[PDB]
Amino acid sequence: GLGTARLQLVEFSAFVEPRHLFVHISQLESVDVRQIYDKFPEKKGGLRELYDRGPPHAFFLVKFWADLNWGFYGVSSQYESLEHMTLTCSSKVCSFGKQVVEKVETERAQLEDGRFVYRLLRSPMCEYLVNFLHKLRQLPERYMMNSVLENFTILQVVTNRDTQELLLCTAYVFEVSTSERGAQHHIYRLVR
Numbered sequence: 001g002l003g004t005a006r007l008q009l010v011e012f013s014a015f016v017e018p019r020h021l022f023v024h025i026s027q028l029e030s031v032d033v034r035q036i037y038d039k040f041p042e043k044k045g046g047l048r049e050l051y052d053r054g055p056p057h058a059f060f061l062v063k064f065w066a067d068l069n070w071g072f073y074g075v076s077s078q079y080e081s082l083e084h085m086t087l088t089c090s091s092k093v094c095s096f097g098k099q100v101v102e103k104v105e106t107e108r109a110q111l112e113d114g115r116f117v118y119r120l121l122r123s124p125m126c127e128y129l130v131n132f133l134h135k136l137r138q139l140p141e142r143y144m145m146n147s148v149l150e151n152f153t154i155l156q157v158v159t160n161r162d163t164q165e166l167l168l169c170t171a172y173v174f175e176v177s178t179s180e181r182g183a184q185h186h187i188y189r190l191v192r
């Protein structure tokens with residue numbers, strides 16, 4: 001699903017433990033990237049610009065329906081490949097199309113069961129998102145949460161640190177689910 005030949009997403013969770021999962025991916029239709037240009041900044045590290053350089057098959061959209069019905073605030077990601085690499089993982093939190101956060105992390109391949117795994121586990125969620133989540137769950141209606149969440153996106157860029165080649169670029173968009181329904185995601189390919 002979320003993956004190329006060179007690098008696949010295996011698991012992605014954001015959570016709080018006193019464990020509640022806001023979102024969870026465990027491991028496609030297309031969407032015109034042009035639809036979502038305005039959801040990200042048009043500066044350097046703009047989605048149009050990234051997509052221009054390519055390659056196009058490295059670009060995905062995840063739509064998350066998140067569970068805000070629930071501490072340590074964490075993000076855990078696991079990628080895997082057959083090639084030994086060092087990864088630069090860049091997360092950009094955007095609000096009204098402006099970047100308000102950039103988190104840049106590095107992970108070296110670890111050999112395990114005949115493949116390379118990259119484990120970025122329990123990275124502490126930045127305080128902007130923690131304060132944001134705390135406010136967001138105070139809202140008395142989901143329709144209000146979704147309205148606020150219309151203006152909030154995440155762009156994750158994963159590159160080969162040694163070659164600077166883009167391996168993965170994922171745009172995240174958000175709504176809230178009911179706790180009855182639980183978290184859900186839909187992964188799409190971005191095309192142009």
Ligand SMILES: *C(=O)CCCCCCCCCCCCC
Nearest residue numbers: 014022066075091103125126174
């Ligand atoms: C460091 O804080 C950056 C983290 C980047 C990924 C965070 C994505 C998960 C956030 C969950 C939010 C749920 C509702 C908006």
